[PDB]
Structures are given as C-alpha cells and as structure tokens.
C-alpha cells in the first residue's frame, strides 16, 4: 500500500488542468499581476500533491483482507517493526526529527476530549468509542468545531519574520564554509536582527545544517567556542555551587551595579587598537589568565 | 498574615530601578552594545563622506500612462496582456479579459433571478436550454441577464476587448 | 588627543617600543636625507566587491534581494505548457490573431500534448520491456501486492 499509494508518484493524478485553469495560474502566480492567492480552490497543484498523499493517508484504515480493507493492524505494525529495525542510525535522525517536527507539537496540546478521536487514527477500538463520543458530543456543542481538531491547533506561531521554512538553507554558506575563521559570528550576527543570544543560538543550527548539506562532519565544539563567554561562566558557576546543571536566573548573583560601573570597560573598548582584523574578532579574546584557560579547555580532555 | 507577608514583598527588579542601579543579572543585554564600539575601529566608524543619508524631493515625477498604451505595454517582457483585470493597477478593470472571465465576474456577482418582462433575457433563454452562462461562448454578450439589442450588448463591451 | 591621550604611553610600549634610528631625520649638508625613511604604501583597495563575492547562487547577480526560484526545467516545461495552452485559447483557427472570445471546447479543452505520452512510450514502456523478463515468482508477486 505504501508503495502503491505514497511512493508511486505516477499513480498520483492531479485534478485536470484545463486551458482556463492553466492561463489562470500563469497569469496568477508566475506572472502574479494579482499578487495574492488566499482562498480554497483547486489550484497551485502543490498543496494538493501533499494533500493527495495526506488524503490517501486519512482514507487508510487497518483491517482484514476479506474486504476492501487494505492492510491489517497486525501486518501494519509488522511493517514498522520490520522497517524500524531496518532503520539506519542516520535514518533515526530523520525519524527522531520527524517525531518532533509533527507529533510532539500535537501530543502537547491534548485533553480528555481528544481521547476518543485519537483511536480513530489506528482504527483500534480499545475501551469505549460509542458511549464516550457522546461525552465529546457534550464539549463539542460547547466548542468550536474548527479548533477542537488536532490538525489546526498550531496554525499560528510567533516571529513570522524569520521562519524555519526558509532558514534551512544556511545563508552565505558558500563563503564562510571555505575558511570558517575568516567568518567570526560578529560578521553574520547582523544578518539576523533578533536578540543577540538568540542570533548566536540559530547560528549554530546554520553551521550544523550547512555541514550535513555538504555531508561533512559538523564542528561539535562550535557552540562552545561560540557561546564561549556563556560557557566559561557556568563552568565557574558550577565550581562554586553544589548543583550540577545549567545556570538559571535564580542562582545568579543579586549585585546592584552602579549606573556607570563599566565606564572603565568602555573607554577601554571605545579606544581599543587591533593590528589585523582577526585579532579584533579572535575567539579567545575572552581568555586572559590561566584561570580562564583551564576552564575553557576543561571540556575537551584532548 | 502570610498573604500580607507576600503582598509586602518587592521584587529584585523593583528594587533595582528604585535605587537607580542596573541589576547584576540584567547586564548581559549591554554586552552586544559594547561589541560594536569594540569592533568599530577603522572603516566601520567612518561614515560615507559628503553623503547625508537623507534626500529631499527634487522633482515632481509621475509616470501614469494612458489606458490604451497600458494594455500591451509589457508585451515582450512578460505574458501577454499584463493588466488583465487589476482594478488597483489599471484605471479600467474589465479591460482586456477573455470572453469567459468577464462572464465569470457577473456570474460570481450574480444578482439573483426575479420576475421578468416578455422581452425575457438570454438568462431565461439559456436556462430553457440547459446552457446557463458559459455556453454562449462565441456570443459577444457579457451580462446574460440584460434586455438589450445584441449590438447593445456588444457595443458596450467593445472597449473591454 | 581627546581619546588617544593616555594609552599612547602604553601603545608605544607594546607595539615594539622606541626603536632608535641614528640620523633618522638628519638632512645631509649636500641636501640628502640620510636613512631613507619607511614609505607609505597604503593604497585605495581595488579587489573588494562583496556583491560579486556572494551572488544569487544559481543565477549569479550581485544582488541582495532574496527572491525565490522556480527550479529550471520545471519553469521551462511550465512555460512551454502555457504557450501551448495560450495557443489554444486566443488563436483557435490558426489565424494567429488574438480571439478575445474563445470557444467553449477551446476554453475547457486540454492542451494537445498535456498528458505526457512520450514519457510513457519512451520511458515507461522501455522499463516495462525489461520488466517482462523478471522472474516468474516475482512478476506475479509484484503484480500481486501492487
């Protein structure tokens, strides 16, 4: 079934494209004189392709071979039990990421209402699916039929300015991949106008996606050399406390620095001198004494 | 007592601004600022010379073209007949559309049926034939529910094409 | 001096310190200046164009506007299907003139070679010919499950 209805791309067939349908799109989106398309019609042929796979998935129901039931729950889970145990460790990465790309944001938003509805997926009647739906009939008459679905609960998020759907491909990757030292983060920090500790957060994922896109092994110690200042503190913050873990706001000190306390730190910076640029952006500028060097490098035993 | 013992409590942040002093935890947010001053040496701190950065209006400019030239204006660069039905880009919306699309507009606008005169419109005629609206294809009428001479239907829509 | 007043004492001290050059600024009585000086070689840089350094990756234009791309081929085939559909609606009798009022069967009729047959006859078949030779315990079993 999977090969017949999911991988057989030729077996997929899109709604017929008439001349009026064609000219519409070529004057609609390739030439989008009328810019936007925000509606629900049989057009754009791309959501439908993923939809056709999706709708084929929804129609699927685990059952006998005596009837039009395509596959048996035993045979189904057998296929997974067969293929899961055939998964390459890298395939686990794609799976583990898939479990979190889709399922985890669903199972987080779940209540008692959805319990009956979850079983309809695996077509696996467990305790009671007839009497319980009337309990859901109670909440659903007092609940919008659109929101109570599981598919729609995540339709909105924050910060549509930088989206994950576009930032997969690392920007400027052709340049900073050639000689990574030539590109300290302060060069690409401006490329992301988000909060700083956030911009240096996403910059890690940019490096890790960049490497995998080129199959090379990713620099596992970039974040530590990236969040150097962050790292050197906690290593100390750990070696003062009796707790093991990261530093939350609570255990941070309660000092009240004056309004002008870093002035000497400023006229230092506002009057710094650097012979070659790399000196200015060196990754070990943070490291002044041995007490620093011992901690920063205390990670890599090597 | 205890609830009052909590209502009395003032936060660390509340204490901080009160004493006019940045708290210790909230000073990492200044670190990126200090980074630019540190990395501003040389080129980055030298503005464009002679260039203000603010430019005033120096002409009264407008390229608003007539409608006729606007029709086939972009013949070569793009897909023929640019301003198909764009009310916002064209002054005349219905200009240039093909026979069905203009019909589609009045078919989606679609002022519902009412009692008619004995000069019953093609809408009455096309229904008694099962050819409701798209099926007068070669025919020049664009609004099927109108009682006028066929030239009057065509003469009104000769500009639109 | 409003800025570099202080650090200069330290700046010299670490940059290499005072190296003493005997007769550095001395002018010879004939007119020569002994100890030909260090010379300023700094020149306006000529090979720096970050725009040509990072281009629109496939169509290399030194730009910065992020405009998405339609994959080559899937744009051309897309266009080639439009003209073939364009050729149907607006110029039906081959007269070439734009017929603004098209025929119904011309409005809704599909493109001539829209439904790819070559891909069937030139590729799908050539696969099926080799498929005819697969083992008998397989060809049925293939047909069976599919």
């Amino acid at each position: 079934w999977y090969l017949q209805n999911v991988l057989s791309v030729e077996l997929m067939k899109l709604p017929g494209r008439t001349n009026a349908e064609k000219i519409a799109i070529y004057r609609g989106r390739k030439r989008p004189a009328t810019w936007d398309k925000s509606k629900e019609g049989l057009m754009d042929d791309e959501v439908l392709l993923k939809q056709i796979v999706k709708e084929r998935w929804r129609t699927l129901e685990f059952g006998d071979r005596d009837a039009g039931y395509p596959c048996t729950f035993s045979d189904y889970i057998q296929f997974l039990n067969e293929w899961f145990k055939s998964l390459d460790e890298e395939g686990l990465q794609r799976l583990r990421e898939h479990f979190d790309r889709k399922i985890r944001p669903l199972l987080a938003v779940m209540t008692h209402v959805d319990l009956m509805w979850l079983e309809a997926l695996t077509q696996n009647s467990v305790q009671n699916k007839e009497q319980l739906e009337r309990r859901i009939g109670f909440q659903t008459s007092l609940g919008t039929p659109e929101f109570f679905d599981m598919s729609k609960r995540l339709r909105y998020e924050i910060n549509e300015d930088y989206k994950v759907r576009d930032e997969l491909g690392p920007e400027l990757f052709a340049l900073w991949s050639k000689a990574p030292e030539r590109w300290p983060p302060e060069r690409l920090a401006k490329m992301y106008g988000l909060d700083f500790t956030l911009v240096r957060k996403i910059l890690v994922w940019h490096h890790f996606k960049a490497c995998y896109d080129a199959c090379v092994e990713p620099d596992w110690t970039l974040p530590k050399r990236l969040f150097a200042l962050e790292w050197i503190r906690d290593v100390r913050a750990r070696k003062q406390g009796l707790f093991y873990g990261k530093l939350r706001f609570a255990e941070q000190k309660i000092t009240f620095y004056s309004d002008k306390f870093l002035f000497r730190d400023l006229v230092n910076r506002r009057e710094a001198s650097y012979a070659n640029v790399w000196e200015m952006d060196d990754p070990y500028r943070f490291l002044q004494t041995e007490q620093d060097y011992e901690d920063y490098w205390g990670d890599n035993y090597d | 007592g205890v609830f009052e013992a909590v209502k009395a409590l003032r936060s660390v942040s509340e204490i901080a601004a009160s004493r006019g002093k940045v708290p210790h935890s909230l000073v990492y947010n200044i670190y990126p600022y200090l980074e630019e001053m540190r990395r501003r040496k040389g080129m980055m701190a030298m503005h464009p010379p002679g260039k203000d950065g603010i430019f005033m209006p120096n002409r009264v400019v407008d390229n608003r073209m007539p409608d006729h030239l606007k029709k086939g204006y972009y013949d070569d660069v793009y897909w023929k007949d640019f301003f198909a039905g764009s009310k916002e880009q064209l002054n005349e919306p219905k200009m240039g559309l093909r026979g069905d699309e203009l019909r589609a507009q009045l078919e989606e606008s679609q002022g519902r049926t009412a009692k008619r005169s004995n000069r019953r419109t093609l809408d009455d005629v096309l229904r008694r034939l099962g050819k409701t609206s798209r099926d007068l294809g070669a025919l020049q009428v664009v609004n099927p529910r109108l009682d006028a001479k066929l030239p009057t239907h065509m003469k009104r829509n000769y500009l639109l094409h | 001096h409003a800025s570099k007043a202080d650090r200069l004492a330290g700046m010299i001290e670490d940059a290499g310190g005072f190296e003493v050059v005997a007769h550095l600024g001395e002018v010879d009585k004939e007119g020569n200046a002994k100890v030909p000086p260090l010379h300023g070689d700094a020149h306006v840089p000529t090979n720096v164009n970050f725009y040509e350094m990072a281009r629109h990756p496939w169509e290399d234009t030194p730009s910065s506007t992020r405009r998405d791309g339609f994959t080559a081929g899937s744009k051309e085939y897309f266009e080639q299907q439009y003209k073939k559909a364009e050729k149907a609606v607006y110029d039906e009798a081959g007269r070439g003139q734009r017929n603004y009022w098209p025929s119904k069967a011309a409005v809704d009729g599909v493109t001539g070679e829209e439904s790819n047959a070559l891909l069937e006859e030139r590729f799908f078949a050539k696969l099926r010919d080799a498929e005819r030779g697969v083992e008998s315990w397989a060809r049925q079993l293939r047909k069976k499950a599919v």
Binding site: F196, L247, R285, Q288 | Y28, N29 | -
Partner: peptide, 21 residues
C-alpha cells in the same frame, strides 16, 4: 591586560546558556 588597558570580558557579560541540543 596586565596594564588594565585591555577590554575585559567578565562572567558578568554572560547571557543564558541556551538549549541548542
């Protein structure tokens, strides 16, 4: 750094150690 003219980087300029992985 020995003369105090060098721009410092204390632990005090540390933000949160973010969960990347």
């Amino acid at each position: 750094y020995a003369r105090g003219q060098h721009p410092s980087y204390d632990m005090v300029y540390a933000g949160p150690m973010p969960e990347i992985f």
